[PDB]
A paper describes a structure:
SARS-CoV-2 RdRp, also referred to as nonstructural protein 12 (Nsp12), is the catalytic center of the macromolecular complex frequently referred to as the replication transcription complex (RTC). The RTC is essential for virus replication because it makes copies of genomic and subgenomic RNAs and polymerizes antisense RNA. In SARS-CoV-2, besides RdRp (Nsp12), the RTC involves nonstructural proteins Nsp7, Nsp8, and others. Nsp12 is the largest component of the complex, and Nsp7 and Nsp8 are considered cofactors.
To provide insights into the structures, key residues of association, and multimeric state between the SARS-CoV-2 RTC’s cofactors, we solved high-resolution crystal structures of Nsp7 bound to Nsp8. Crystals of Nsp7/8A were shown to have a truncated N-terminus (at residue Glu78) for Nsp8. In all of our crystal forms, the heterodimer formed between Nsp7 and 8 places Nsp7 near the half β-barrel-like domain of Nsp8 with the N-terminal helix of Nsp8 extended and pointing away (approximate dimensions of 40 × 40 × 46 Å). The similarity between all heterodimers in all our crystal forms is remarkable, with a root mean square deviation of 0.82 Å for 184 aligned Cα atoms despite different unit cell dimensions, different space groups, and different asymmetric units. In contrast to previously reported Nsp7/8 structures from other coronaviruses, in all three of our structures, either as in the asymmetric content or symmetry related, a heterotetramer or a dimer of heterodimers is present as an elongated, thick rod shape of 40 × 92 Å. The differing crystal forms show only slight variation in the packing of Nsp7/8 heterodimers to form heterotetramers. In Nsp7/8A, the tetramers are formed by the crystallographic twofold rotational symmetry. The heterotetramer interface involves a total of six helices: α1 and α2 of Nsp7 and their symmetry mates (twofold rotation) α1′ and α2′ and α1 of Nsp8 and the symmetry mate α1′. The tetramer interface is not as extensive as that of the dimer having 1813 Å2 with 73% being hydrophobic.
Numbering used by the authors:
A (entry chain B), D (entry chain B): 77 to 191
B (entry chain A), C (entry chain A): 0 to 79
Write the structure that this text describes.
């Protein structure tokens, strides 16, 4: 696996170098979010009202993407439907405040639909 | 004839990166990556090519143990 | 970090073009295209990457019925 | 094969578009020669004195690449060893002249070695 892994590390380094050369707003968004631990759980859909599930690691990333019931991601707007914690317990949108932030079981999971 | 050729070349690499991560073991998911790879190559305008590229790239980003993006930036910042 | 990334992306496409031409049926030739594909990705300077790219591209050009280069230039000159 | 061929024509068009964007002297040489019918018969070797076999369609392409016993191809010099015609009959280097050109059985085959 030693000879095989060196080719994998070389092809993956080339992959993101090409993506970095594209400089696409929607591509840079999902890559930068993935760097902060904000990764999707399924294939990002393109049809309207389709399910998307993203992970939000900390509260500082939540306010950067969520505004009210709208969720901005991949250069698109998403209508939030469910919010759960690490124990699969549904969390209301009113609980997520700056005062109640360190009381929830981070990270959370947002199930939203495309606009 | 434009940047369109750079996105289509990258989509072939991304599908090759997935197949080296042994994604072909899932006939359900591999057929979705193949069909998106075919959609990008047959796209006309850049808008359809990039949006399909987002769906294909999200497949890679959805696998936690596959790639740590912070690791590749370290190997990149050490050489520059 | 340079044009080096454009040659390595193209070599992945060229290997993918060969595999779609069903070159994998020859274990002797496919192992040579795979090893050249691995040599380009692991190359350090651009001189070694392009010279290995010449050997890999010559595999495609050596197959007469595979690709007529004049045909692709017609589909390219008609659209431009 | 109709759906599969459209992807093949799309990937091959992208392949040469990338090669055209590279603008490499050795890459442009073998592609332009292949357009004129001057195609290699085996993998272009990189080691010295290794065998290379190229096809030369007409006499106007011969003088563009061959000078004496030296053969220029892929941005490299090659020492010619054998020259045969369409009937596998070995042709000497002295026969290939402008006066005896339409008498040979074109195309020819050159077996040369790297310098």
């Amino acid at each position: 696996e030693d000879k095989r892994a060196k080719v994998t590390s070389a092809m993956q380094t080339m992959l993101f170098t090409m993506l970095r050369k594209l400089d696409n707003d929607a591509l840079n968004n999902i890559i930068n979010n993935a760097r902060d631990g904000c990764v999707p759980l399924n294939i990002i859909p393109l049809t309207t009202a389709a399910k998307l599930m993203v992970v939000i690691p900390d509260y500082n990333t939540y306010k950067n993407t969520c505004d009210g019931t709208t969720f901005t991601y991949a250069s698109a707007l998403w209508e939030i439907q469910q919010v759960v914690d690490a124990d699969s317990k549904i969390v209301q949108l009113s609980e997520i405040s700056m005062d109640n932030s360190p009381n929830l079981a981070w990270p959370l999971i947002v199930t939203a639909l495309r606009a | 004839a434009s940047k369109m050729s750079d996105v289509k070349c990258t989509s072939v690499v991304l599908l090759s990166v997935l197949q080296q991560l042994r994604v072909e073991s899932s006939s359900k998911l591999w057929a979705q990556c193949v069909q998106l790879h075919n959609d990008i190559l047959l796209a006309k305008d850049t808008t359809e090519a990039f949006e399909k590229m987002v769906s294909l790239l999200s497949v890679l980003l959805s696998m936690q143990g596959a790639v740590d993006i912070n690791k590749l930036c370290e190997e990149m910042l050490d050489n520059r």
